[PDB]
Amino acid sequence: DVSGTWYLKAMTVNLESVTPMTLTTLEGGNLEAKVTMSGRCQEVKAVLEKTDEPGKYTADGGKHVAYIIRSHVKDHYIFYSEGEGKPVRGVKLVGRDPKNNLEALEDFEKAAGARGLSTESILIPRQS
Ligand SMILES: [Cl-]
Ligand SMILES: [Cl-]
Ligand SMILES: [Zn+2]
Ligand SMILES: [Zn+2]
Ligand SMILES: [Zn+2]
């Protein structure tokens, strides 16, 4: 399932790069996404609303759409999101291990090229 704590391994190219993110399934199929982030150290939570289409969720009042895409590598997923002052979109590779082993990058690369993002720069976190 997609619930768990997910650590960012690679992203196409701040705020967007906060890691890890924890996803909890809510009654009805929606998900809560939560991270910890001028001031105090604080948890920040948001609901991803399930749609009628498998793997597709919406957020921020419908202005954000997130797709959860399977990886061939166990305990990894790819997240593809489209959002908005200008329109923005990007692909993230995530996994359950805190250590970044960069062993699922082929699928990240393929997901990006399938969506017209094959020339964007990639950001690789080393630490949370
Ligand atoms: Cl990994
Ligand atoms: Cl990886
Ligand atoms: Zn759709
Ligand atoms: Zn990995
Ligand atoms: Zn693959």
Left (φ > 0), alpha (ψ -120 to 50) or beta: where does 26 sit? beta
C-alpha 35/C-alpha 120 separation (Å) is: 25
Q: How far is the CA of 86 from the centre of ligand 1 (A)?
A: 32
DSSP annotation of 114: H
| Residue 20 preceded by cis peptide, ω within 30 | yes
Domain that holds residue 12: 1-128
Which residues fall within 8 angstroms of residue 5, CB to CB, at 6 or more apart? 20, 21, 22, 96
In angstroms, what is the span from residue 74 Cα to ligand 1's centroid? Answer: 10
- Compute, in angstroms, the gap from residue 62 CA to the centroid of ligand 3: 12
Any idea which ligand is nearest the CA of 71? Answer: 5
Compute CA 26 distance to the chain's CA centroid, rounded to the nearest angstrom: 18
Ligand 4 center from residue 86 Cα (angstroms): 31
CA distances to 15, 100, 119 from 84, in Å: 14, 29, 20
Domain total of the chain:
1
Token output for 34: 């939560």
Which run of H or of E encompasses 4? Answer: strand 4-12
Structure determined by: X-ray
- Euclidean distance between CA atoms 43 and 114, whole angstroms: 34
C-alpha 116 – ligand 2 centre gap (Å): 21
How many C-beta atoms lie closer than 10 Å to residue 80's C-beta? 21
Helix, strand, or coil (residue 88): strand
Compute the distance from residue 5 Cα to the ligand 3 centre, in Å: 26
**Is there a contact between 98 and 72 (Cβ–Cβ < 8 Å)?**
no
Beta bridge partners, 90, equal: 81
- CA 95, CA 116: separation in Å to the nearest integer? 23
Which two structure tokens, joined as six digits, stand for 52? 């009628």
53 CA to centre of ligand 3 in angstroms: 6
Q: What is the DSSP string of 21-68?
A: EEEEE-TTS-EEEEEE---S--EEEEEEEE-SSTTEEEEGGGTEEEEE
User: From the centroid of its chain, how far is CA 114?
Assistant: 17
Model resolution, angstroms: 1.8
Distance CA 56, CA 50 (A): 7
Q: How far, in Å, CA of 66 to CA of 73, rounded?
A: 20
Say which CATH number the domain at 24 has.
Answer: 2.40.128.20
Beta bridge partners of 122: 12
